Amino acid sequence: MNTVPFTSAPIEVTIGIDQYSFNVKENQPFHGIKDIPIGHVHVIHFQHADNSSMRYGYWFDCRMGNFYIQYDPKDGLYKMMEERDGAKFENIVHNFKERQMMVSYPKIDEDDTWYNLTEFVQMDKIRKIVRKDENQFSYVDSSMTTVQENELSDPAHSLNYTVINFKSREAIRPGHEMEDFLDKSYYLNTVMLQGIFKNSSNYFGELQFAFLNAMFFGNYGSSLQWHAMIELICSSATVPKHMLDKLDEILYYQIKTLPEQYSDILLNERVWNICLYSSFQKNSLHNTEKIMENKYPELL
Amino acid sequence: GAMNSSNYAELFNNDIKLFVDDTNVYRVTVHKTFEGNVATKAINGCIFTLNPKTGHLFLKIIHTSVWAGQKRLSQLAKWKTAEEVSALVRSLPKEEQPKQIIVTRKAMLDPLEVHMLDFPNIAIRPTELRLPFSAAMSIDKLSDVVMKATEPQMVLFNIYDDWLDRISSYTAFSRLTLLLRALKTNEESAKMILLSDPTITIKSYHLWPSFTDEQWITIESQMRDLILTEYGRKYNV
Numbered sequence: 001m002n003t004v005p006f007t008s009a010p011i012e013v014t015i016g017i018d019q020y021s022f023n024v025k026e027n028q029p030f031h032g033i034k035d036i037p038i039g040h041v042h043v044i045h046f047q048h049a050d051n052s053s054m055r056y057g058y059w060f061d062c063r064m065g066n067f068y069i070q071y072d073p074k075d076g077l078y079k080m081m082e083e084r085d086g087a088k089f090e091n092i093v094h095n096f097k098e099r100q101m102m103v104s105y106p107k108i109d110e111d112d113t114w115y116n117l118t119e120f121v122q123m124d125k126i127r128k129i130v131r132k133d134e135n136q137f138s139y140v141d142s143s144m145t146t147v148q149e150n151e152l153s154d155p156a157h158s159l160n161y162t163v164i165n166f167k168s169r170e171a172i173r174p175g176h177e178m179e180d181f182l183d184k185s186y187y188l189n190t191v192m193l194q195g196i197f198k199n200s201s202n203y204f205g206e207l208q209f210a211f212l213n214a215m216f217f218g219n220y221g222s223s224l225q226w227h228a229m230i231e232l233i234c235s236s237a238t239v240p241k242h243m244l245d246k247l248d249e250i251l252y253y254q255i256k257t258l259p260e261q262y263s264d265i266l267l268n269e270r271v272w273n274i275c276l277y278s279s280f281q282k283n284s285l286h287n288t289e290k291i292m293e294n295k296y297p298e299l300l
Numbered sequence: 301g302a303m304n305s306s307n308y309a310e311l312f313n314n315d316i317k318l319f320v321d322d323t324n325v326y327r328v329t330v331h332k333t334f335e336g337n338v339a340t341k342a343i344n345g346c347i348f349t350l351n352p353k354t355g356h357l358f359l360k361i362i363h364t365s366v367w368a369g370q371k372r373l374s375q376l377a378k379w380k381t382a383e384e385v386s387a388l389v390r391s392l393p394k395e396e397q398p399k400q401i402i403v404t405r406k407a408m409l410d411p412l413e414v415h416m417l418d419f420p421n422i423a424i425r426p427t428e429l430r431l432p433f434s435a436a437m438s439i440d441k442l443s444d445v446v447m448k449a450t451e452p453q454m455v456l457f458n459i460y461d462d463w464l465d466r467i468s469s470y471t472a473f474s475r476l477t478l479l480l481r482a483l484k485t486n487e488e489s490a491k492m493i494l495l496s497d498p499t500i501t502i503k504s505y506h507l508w509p510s511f512t513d514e515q516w517i518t519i520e521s522q523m524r525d526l527i528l529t530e531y532g533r534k535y536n537v
């Protein structure tokens with residue numbers, strides 16, 4: 001079990017750790033988060049009390065180094081940092097643990113939610129979507145735009161998601177215009193899965209990595225990316241059977257976890273009604289359709 | 301974006317543009333089978349592509365053999381439409397290619413957008429106008445060349461005949477649309493109007509009769525009357 005110590009909490013802030021969150025009051029004696037499960041990628045995120053504008057946060061993997069949080073009063077946010085002196089880090093963490101100034105990552109033992117939401121999310125790929133190579137962790141906020149959004153403006157601070165565009169030469173073979181536009185199997189299976197991702201796990205990882213940035217930061221371009229990657233599968237007549245089974249499982253847990261009150265801005269009515277009710281794979285997402293219809297029958 | 305009454309005069313500026321109408325591409329007769337079922341028999345049709353400034357009509361003719369062994373023909377027909385417009389542009393010299401193509405039905409936008417990905421600088425646009433181009437198969441000479449075709453081919457016409465010698469394209473287009481609206485609302489009366497006086501003939505190289513300026517005014521007014529009329533007969537006013 002790993003730990004993300006905080007130097008201090010000088011400003012009132014809601015802190016998120018994966019799908020959990022807790023309130024810290026201005027100058028409350030808070031010194032971080034303990035018992036974080038090794039083996040998964042995590043995100044630790046922030047919403048200031050005084051300015052709910054800008055949810056921001058950091059993707060990290062405790063196996064990749066010792067990380068801490070330190071408020072920076074010039075730039076005005078809680079920054080993730082790496083401590084390279086490992087003896088200094090253990091000593092600091094042990095003091096805070098002894099004085100019981102850390103909140104415990106509150107995992108219920110029955111609960112596989114986090115694993116089911118990050119199963120294919122890979123930290124090494126995250127560094128490439130969110131390019132900042134001097135750090136082993138990756139910062140994301142509400143306002144960051146995607147590479148494709150910047151095509152339709154600071155490239156260093158963008159989300160380099162995989163470019164998917166259904167009306168594009170990459171997506172449409174000369175001479176199969178209608179075939180390829182109505183049945184996207186060529187674009188999914190040859191162009192994307194065989195040419196760009198290499199395998200379905202890499203593809204599931206971005207879909208999971210898209211969704212989590214939408215849910216945790218209200219990142220619009222990430223929501224667009226999640227929906228695109230769903231639609232490309234649902235609109236392909238030929239999908240490996242194991243990908244459809246896994247997809248159903250992935251979406252089921254994403255819909256389960258979504259805040260009940262946020263469905264109106266995170267979920268695209270056209271994509272979901274198309275995918276569940278009109279597309280080639282309309283009969284292939286049984287779990288996802290059962291949970292959508294029982295929880296968001298309004299959208300449909 | 302879309303084309304409507306407020307930007308109506310863009311059609312006659314000097315940017316090359318084309319209207320595409322696909323309402324006559326897939327045409328069928330519906331009939332009873334010996335077993336008392338219903339079946340369609342397709343007949344030849346055409347893609348109606350028109351330069352509104354010059355009057356040039358690229359009648360790209362659809363023989364029935366193109367539907368053979370195909371499914372979902374109404375959907376295929378929008379893609380067939382998109383495919384034969386795209387190869388026409390490809391063939392055409394660059395300085396003759398359109399800067400805009402305006403489709404008369406929104407269902408064509410995606411088929412045409414996909415077929416023209418290679419021409420990102422050609423704007424594909426819808427329109428709010430209710431243009432009467434479906435009535436083009438009420439022009440006898442066009443109907444004739446479509447029904448006689450034994451293979452897919454493209455015949456070129458000027459739908460304005462020689463009118464641009466005496467009127468502007470705005471006025472020529474308005475005549476054409478009034479003629480077509482009339483033919484669409486009541487083909488018989490519209491046609492009775494056009495051919496009553498046997499002294500006025502259609503030149504072999506024309507679609508419409510050879511009216512003087514004064515005779516066109518009479519004709520145009522009669523066609524308005526007809527369109528007003530049939531509107532009353534249709535709503536009881």
Ligand SMILES: CCOC(=O)Nc1cccnc1
Nearest residue numbers: 121122125126202205206209
């Ligand atoms: C584009 C090749 O696939 C990925 O990069 N997938 C990914 C991205 C981010 C997190 N986990 C997986």
Ligand SMILES: CCOC(=O)Nc1cccnc1
Nearest residue numbers: 360361362384387388453454
């Ligand atoms: C339905 C008939 O289509 C054509 O005649 N198309 C065509 C293709 C290339 C160049 N010009 C015309």
